[PDB]
């Protein structure tokens, strides 16, 4: 799906799977059960 934009910029498509994924993460964000912030390696040693 990612390559469709390269070949056919004119027509817009929707990836129902990715949209469902982003909808679910946003719902969890609103509900408060979001993903914890991952800590970088630079932290501590």
């Amino acid at each position: 799906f990612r390559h469709l934009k390269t070949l056919y910029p004119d027509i817009e498509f929707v990836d129902l799977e990715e949209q469902y994924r982003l909808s679910m993460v946003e719902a969890k964000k609103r509900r408060g059960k979001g993903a914890p912030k991952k800590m970088k390696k630079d932290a501590a040693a």
Binding site: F1, L4, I11, E12, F13, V14, L16
Partner: protein, 331 residues
């Protein structure tokens, strides 16, 4: 008919108008001596089917999202080329395009089907050629109803009608499904089909008798070559009054939809938390022209009556996963 008294010993269901060829029972139609090549072709077929599923949905703006429902792709591999075949339905029919303003612009769906084959170098067939190493063509076939294919019917009710059964099946929605087709008399249609076939056979048989009895009253015994030759006469009289405008349509099978059932099983209704199944059985689910006449039913994949076209599609709602199972009978 069961009698067939005035015809003679014969019978050929092998007509391409009375039986579905068993090659069509499979989504990928290929034989390769190199089995590894056969496996990779099958995998590619499945992948490209999923890609086309991704491709179908389109949007013009935030308030315009157009889902184009399509059936499973029928991949036809020949020694030289591959054809991808599928039926599709476009809900955005725009008053059946009654207004002529449609002639001056291409909607998203037209552009999608055009880039399928027509675009010169950037069409999908070129990329699919790279994957398959042969000529590739795609057949989009339009369906004007959604209940003419089990695939399209299940997909539509599973992807486009969430609001109509999310909290129970609505009365109007349940009524529309039950009135998609007029209640037809399966017995009458089956008997009419049998009588028509009998009439065709009698007409041909009479043509034989008339031709051979006279044959312009010139050809006689010791001249017909009764040992091995079977040349009875001119082709004209073999099929007198048996032409393309009367024979083929009335021998075509699987014309009418007599029975159809839909089953909404899943977590649709927001009950205490359990699951519910709603079934809508309308019509009959057996073909009456197979047990009275002499044609015999063939079981697709050795487990599906030919007259039955069934399919189920899943999706996800707020509660989980649900499945819409549609089974259709085509007399």
């Amino acid at each position: 008919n069961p009698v067939v008294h005035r015809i003679g010993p014969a019978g050929n269901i092998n007509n391409k108008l009375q039986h579905l060829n068993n090659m069509n029972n499979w989504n990928t139609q290929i034989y390769n001596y190199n089995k590894n090549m056969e496996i990779m072709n099958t995998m590619n077929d499945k992948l490209i089917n999923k890609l086309l599923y991704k491709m179908m949905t389109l949007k013009l703006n935030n308030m315009n999202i157009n889902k184009i429902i399509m059936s499973k792709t029928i991949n036809q591999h020949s020694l030289n080329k591959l054809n991808i075949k599928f039926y599709y339905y476009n809900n955005d029919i725009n008053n059946n395009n009654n207004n002529n303003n449609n002639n001056y612009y291409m909607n998203m769906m037209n552009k999608l089907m055009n880039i399928m084959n027509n675009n010169m170098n950037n069409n999908l067939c070129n990329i699919l050629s790279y994957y398959y190493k042969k000529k590739v063509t795609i057949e989009p076939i339009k369906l004007s109803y959604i209940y003419l294919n089990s695939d399209i019917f299940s997909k539509y009710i599973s992807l486009n009608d969430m609001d109509k059964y999310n909290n129970g099946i609505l009365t109007n929605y349940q009524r529309m499904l039950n009135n998609i087709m007029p209640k037809l008399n399966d017995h009458n249609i089956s008997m009419n089909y049998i009588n028509n076939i009998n009439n065709i056979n009698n007409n041909k048989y009479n043509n034989m008798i008339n031709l051979l009895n006279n044959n312009n009253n010139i050809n006689n015994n010791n001249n017909y070559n009764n040992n091995n030759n079977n040349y009875i006469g001119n082709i004209n009289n073999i099929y007198n009054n048996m032409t393309i405008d009367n024979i083929p349509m009335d021998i075509l099978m699987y014309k009418y939809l007599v029975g159809w059932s839909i089953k909404f099983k899943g977590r649709l209704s927001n009950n205490n938390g359990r699951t519910s199944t709603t079934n809508l059985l309308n019509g009959t689910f057996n073909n009456k022209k197979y047990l009275w006449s002499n044609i015999n039913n063939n079981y697709k994949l050795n487990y599906i009556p030919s007259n039955h076209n069934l399919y189920n599609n899943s999706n996800i709602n707020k509660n989980g996963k649900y499945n819409i199972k549609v089974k259709l009978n085509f007399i």
